[PDB]
């Protein structure tokens, strides 16, 4: 039985988090830790602490971890005989190459710090040179999401983003594969992007759809703006445009991990089998 330590990050409905229960434990969900750091031996002493005879884990660094992803880990686990432990990346970054290193779930997967990436993870082709990936569990376009009778865009070839009017205000995810694809592929809007992009993918949200408006566009992976168009009451949402940078989602383990095939193979099997129709209805409230 192996023992991987397994790195997350929080984008609905992928993970979500909350609070550890009554009794400190996690009925419907896992137990992970939220501690803010890519130090791999605080992990260890915390995790060990954790799972001894008088746990004294600071409480606040207590979640309770659930979503499309974890109901997946929890199915690989069984399948292929690993217990995890569990833990949020500490700086909320997927990852990105800045000041020399990889950043985010990248950055811990090279630095030994976590085993293994399990979130809404984009398989591009900067992180296919350093890390491994998986088969792809989930497929997604990246998106344009704006106010009903607000901004309207053709696409990411939409003369509006590429020559801005003063003010127009859109951004994008940093240390995201979106940040990526705009940095390679449009480096003058990416330069215009940088005052306007944010932490997380729900400030983004947050800024285009809370009033005052801070953002007049947002660009983000469509299957997460779809997941906040769809619980979204009042209907004053929409994504717009013909697709773009269209990515897989994948598990991220190490460069040549022999884990990668056997994770792959089963990844493979629950699509066939109709799992990852299982979870998407369950994740994306469908019926």
């Known amino acids: 039985k192996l023992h991987l330590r397994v790195v997350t990050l929080i984008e609905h409905p992928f993970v979500f988090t909350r609070e550890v229960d009554d009794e400190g434990l996690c009925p419907a969900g896992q137990l992970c830790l939220d501690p803010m750091t890519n130090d791999s031996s605080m992990l260890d002493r915390l995790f060990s602490s954790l799972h001894s005879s008088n746990d004294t884990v600071p409480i606040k660094f207590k979640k309770c971890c659930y979503g499309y992803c974890i109901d997946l880990l929890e199915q690989l686990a069984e399948d292929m005989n690993f217990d995890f432990d569990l833990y949020i990346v500490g700086d909320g970054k997927y990852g990105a190459w800045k000041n020399g290193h990889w950043t985010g779930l ?5 630095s030994g710090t976590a085993n293994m990436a399990v979130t809404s993870f984009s398989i591009n082709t900067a992180r296919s040179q350093v890390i491994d990936f998986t088969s792809p569990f989930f497929s997604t376009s990246l998106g344009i999401l704006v106010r009903t009778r607000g901004t309207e865009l053709s696409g990411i070839h939409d003369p509006k983003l590429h020559h801005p009017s003063q003010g127009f205000r859109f951004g994008t995810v940093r240390e995201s594969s979106a940040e990526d694809y705009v940095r390679q592929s449009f480096p003058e809007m990416h330069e215009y992007m940088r005052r306007y992009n944010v932490p ?21 992976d469509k299957a997460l703006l ?5 619980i979204d009451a009042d ?3 929409l994504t717009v445009g013909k697709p773009f940078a269209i990515e897989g989602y994948g598990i991220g383990l190490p460069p040549n991990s022999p884990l990668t095939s056997n994770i792959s193979e089963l990844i493979s099997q629950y699509k066939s089998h109709g799992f990852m129709d299982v979870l998407h209805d369950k994740w994306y409230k469908v019926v």
Do not use: H, R, W
Request: charged share 30%; with cysteine; glycine share 6%.
């Open 200 to 220: 997380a993918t729900p400030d983004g949200v947050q800024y285009l759809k809370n009033d005052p408006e801070k953002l007049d566009a947002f660009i983000m």
């Open 226 to 230: 779809d997941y906040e168009v769809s």
């Open 106 to 110: 990248v950055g811990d997967l090279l």
């Open 235 to 237: 209907c004053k949402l």
